[PDB]
Amino acid sequence: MAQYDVADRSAIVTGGGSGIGRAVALTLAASGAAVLVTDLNEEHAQAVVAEIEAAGGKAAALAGDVTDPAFGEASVAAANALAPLKIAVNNAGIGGEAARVGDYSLDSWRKVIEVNLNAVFYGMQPQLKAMAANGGGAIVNMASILGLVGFANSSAYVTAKHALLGLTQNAALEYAADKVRVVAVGPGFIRTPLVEANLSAEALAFLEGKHALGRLGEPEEVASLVAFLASDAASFITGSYHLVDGGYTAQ
Amino acid sequence: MAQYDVADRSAIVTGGGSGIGRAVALTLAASGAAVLVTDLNEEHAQAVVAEIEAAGGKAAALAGDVTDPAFGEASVAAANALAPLKIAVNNAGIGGEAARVGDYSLDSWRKVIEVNLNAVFYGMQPQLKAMAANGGGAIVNMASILGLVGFANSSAYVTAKHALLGLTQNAALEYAADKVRVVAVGPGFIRTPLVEANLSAEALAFLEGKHALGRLGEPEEVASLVAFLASDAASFITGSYHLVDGGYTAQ
Amino acid sequence: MAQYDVADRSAIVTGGGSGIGRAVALTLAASGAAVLVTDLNEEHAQAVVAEIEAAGGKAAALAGDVTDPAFGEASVAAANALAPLKIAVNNAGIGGEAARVGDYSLDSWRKVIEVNLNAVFYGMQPQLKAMAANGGGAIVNMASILGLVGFANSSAYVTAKHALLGLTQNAALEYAADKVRVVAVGPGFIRTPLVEANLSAEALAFLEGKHALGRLGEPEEVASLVAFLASDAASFITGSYHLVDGGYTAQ
Amino acid sequence: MAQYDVADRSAIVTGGGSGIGRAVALTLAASGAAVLVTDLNEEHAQAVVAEIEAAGGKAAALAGDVTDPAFGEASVAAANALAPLKIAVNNAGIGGEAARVGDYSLDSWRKVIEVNLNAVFYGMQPQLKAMAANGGGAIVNMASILGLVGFANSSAYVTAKHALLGLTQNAALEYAADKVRVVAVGPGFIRTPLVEANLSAEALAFLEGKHALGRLGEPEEVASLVAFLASDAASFITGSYHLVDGGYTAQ
Ligand SMILES: NC(=O)c1ccc[n+]([C@@H]2O[C@H](COP(=O)([O-])OP(=O)(O)OC[C@H]3O[C@@H](n4cnc5c(N)ncnc54)[C@H](O)[C@@H]3O)[C@@H](O)[C@H]2O)c1
Ligand SMILES: NC(=O)c1ccc[n+]([C@@H]2O[C@H](COP(=O)([O-])OP(=O)(O)OC[C@H]3O[C@@H](n4cnc5c(N)ncnc54)[C@H](O)[C@@H]3O)[C@@H](O)[C@H]2O)c1
Ligand SMILES: NC(=O)c1ccc[n+]([C@@H]2O[C@H](COP(=O)([O-])OP(=O)(O)OC[C@H]3O[C@@H](n4cnc5c(N)ncnc54)[C@H](O)[C@@H]3O)[C@@H](O)[C@H]2O)c1
Ligand SMILES: NC(=O)c1ccc[n+]([C@@H]2O[C@H](COP(=O)([O-])OP(=O)(O)OC[C@H]3O[C@@H](n4cnc5c(N)ncnc54)[C@H](O)[C@@H]3O)[C@@H](O)[C@H]2O)c1
Ligand SMILES: [Zn+2]
Ligand SMILES: [Zn+2]
Ligand SMILES: [Zn+2]
Ligand SMILES: [Zn+2]
């Protein structure tokens, strides 16, 4: 019977057509949030919107690329047109080329920075200004355990994640006075069916060994934290990093 | 309309007679938890159980000293009477003398360690075993911003809150496989009646400037995070540190 | 009267003609390091080389832009031509537009990222492979206290410097087997010529008041740490972040 | 040919008789420091002074228990007699029992805390006062990787070392005005001869795998960083925690 004060407000969830973003959208809607579900995938974004409408919640699907600053502008105006924008979850992420730092391809590095960092930046610009004018809010940026620690062959990913904590802090420092809070969430390895369906049974069991809890997290487990940080309950929580990693980074 | 997944179990709130402890007990009871308010101050702890009971909640008081390991054994029994124990908040803490390391009294150092660190460990011992026995749960150790950063003339206090992150980290690693989660919460300067009663207007301002949000935090604001990480919704969050600091440590 | 085990090997130092990168190159070459001083400003790189050679040290200038991957291929080759490349200090950086996250120029954001992060990555690529090749070495990345904590209106910079900590961690993990150590250094505010030149005395004062020591650092004071980490003495130090901030991030 | 600007003054190295304390004494002395080995083992402390005078340096033993505040007072008198005290390494530490938090021996916990933390504090009080009067100095506090991250079954230790970073921060803030620097070192697992002696082949192989460099640290490698941070070359470094771990904490 978990419910969060996220009503009477619109909420953007970028990359919300699948996995953790989906879990976020559904959870936020199911506490009364007007959820603008944005994604490169028009059809997934609609497929989610349909569940939220079917569950009894308001939700709308903008399709687009977060690397387009204009698309960030157009997700804020679409959200504001459901309810005042008072929530943004910059979740949309790709995993990138699997290569060492000396072998990493300059286009693949640049792509991973563009999406996992710069698109969060482009998205935040019209989120901060909207929330700031309409009296306050909460931006949740989707980082990782790998915004704190390393993992071999995922340098660009590791690097992007790490960058987010600094942009999170700075946005939080700058817009605290406008009562717009900015936090970062830091999951351990989550069973997003991309992961499940990409990994061998041997590989899955290895990562499982990295986390003290002895499993991978579920999307719903990240969403619950995101929803809490996005709520009025977390009114004193800004600029900070929050792990959901079943004890990965504790050793 | 915030509500947390803590029903059908007992919660020990140490130093729950007053301040953030009192906010926590209130907030935990209100969502269905059976709260054992433990305090030195038997009557404070009673006063709090009444508000719970006059709000429809369930709760009992136990007066004792967390510095006595026995009292921590006795707190777990008393809680497990009410319902199976699955939450414990080690919240009880004290200020200690206002001095520089080189001028610190060997008693005030030893005292602040004993209460603010050792007593947290003493309570944890039975807390863990009892939670493991009954298939798992959640321990939230009340730390601070000052378990991460310094404050001048509060060495003993800062040292103790730093310590708590390690204890938290080890306990989480060691009892993951028992589904017993352990986390720590770092508030910024909270507006308790003792802080309101102690601070000059000038000193109060100075601390406000140090927080990005441009105010001290309210107890209910710490209470909310604690209730969430104590809840089933936080089932993948363990060993981690969680700030509720209004952007104090983001600069 | 300090000396460093940095002899019989070549040492790239990006941003070499000015402030901190200059001090690095001096300190390294004064312990017998063959210093390639690389920089946009040919004639600034030349003026440092001369100071080295004048003190007895072996140094070469190679003016260009680190935002060209070609110019890190070339910088390495021209280092290997003096002595085996066993040291690289990715020090070159820029500050970017003084503006809020919401108002931040996209041009300036991408230009601050490019120099401070991507160029570090482009120049680390051949560095890593080159040092791996001459049976080991050490890369030092010039981050900041602002890879740890925020400073408002410098979001891009802060974001960039935060990123380096991940890249650094990932490089280290990935090339530890090949005995190539990677480490970040985090200075606080340093009185470079350009910092002394553009700060007003009022600004300068305010900053000194945020550092415990009550002054800004000197470049001499950053180069020593850089030199030590880049030496054979720091043989068991890889992947870690080392603050030279006069107590700035301790509060 | 590494040398450190640690001359024209006395150093305290507590635990200076064996392992990382012994390596520290040897390294400091060689660069013109007048070392006061202080240790429990009367003999071992003397055998280290002998190695120091044999290589040509200046050194004195003083056998005692750091847990005795008076012995700190006496150690500092002894140092101030050799030369004005401007180094203090609080190196002296013990393991405690290998048990879970819930089963952990209450005296073994209290013992560990007493030495690893409180003794460092007891010792610091006269260290700090003496260094402020005689125009500044440095205090290196020996922490560990286990001051940041957990290790299963060593909870009292992990706790004690975490605590050191708080004490280290606070001291640093309070006496920065008096030019007393306070830092912490975090070694990874170090194959000191006592550790060479107590590990099975199976257990040593397990720890080596946890370190990116794929071997345990040598005590000379920890000795070098301690020496640097203690030196005039580190004059803008205070309040900070310096890992020498072999990439242990970078994953
Ligand atoms: N183990 C994990 O899965 C894990 C752990 C930590 C953090 N994360 C982060 O969580 C977020 C979501 O991860 P996930 O595992 O749920 O991913 P996913 O692959 O399941 O879904 C991500 C969605 O992002 C969308 N997307 C990609 N690029 C886009 C772009 N340029 N514009 C718009 N939409 C775009 C895709 O359509 C996709 O549906 C990412 O930021 C990821 O980095 C994932
Ligand atoms: N500024 C703040 O108020 C602030 C900020 C961050 C963290 N905290 C932490 O929150 C916790 C609660 O602090 P607060 O501000 O609500 O203070 P408080 O004094 O208002 O409440 C603390 C309660 O703990 C009890 N207590 C103290 N020592 C005890 C002992 N040995 N045995 C049993 N009960 C004992 C007291 O009787 C008191 O009722 C402490 O750990 C404190 O350090 C407080
Ligand atoms: N307060 C400070 O000065 C301070 C403190 C912390 C960190 N840092 C970092 O230290 C490094 C040096 O900064 P600084 O203070 O010495 O500044 P600086 O301007 O004095 O030195 C930077 C040098 O890099 C050169 N440069 C810039 N872009 C380049 C490019 N694309 N290719 C080649 N050369 C280029 C400049 O011409 C200059 O010689 C940077 O990474 C900076 O962020 C500086
Ligand atoms: N693997 C490692 O060796 C390692 C890694 C990281 C941190 N550390 C820390 O490094 C420090 C030195 O440990 P070590 O590896 O040299 O261990 P060690 O046991 O070889 O040396 C510790 C020394 O301290 C002395 N000592 C102990 N209690 C004392 C007391 N009360 N008063 C005076 N002297 C006392 C002992 O006689 C001994 O010579 C400790 O603080 C330890 O926790 C050790
Ligand atoms: Zn389509
Ligand atoms: Zn599909
Ligand atoms: Zn499944
Ligand atoms: Zn109030």
Ligand SMILES: [Zn+2]
């Ligand atoms: Zn700070």
Ligand SMILES: [Zn+2]
């Ligand atoms: Zn030119």
Ligand SMILES: [Zn+2]
């Ligand atoms: Zn010029």
Ligand SMILES: [Zn+2]
């Ligand atoms: Zn000057």
Ligand SMILES: [Zn+2]
């Ligand atoms: Zn050996």
Ligand SMILES: [Zn+2]
């Ligand atoms: Zn780790």
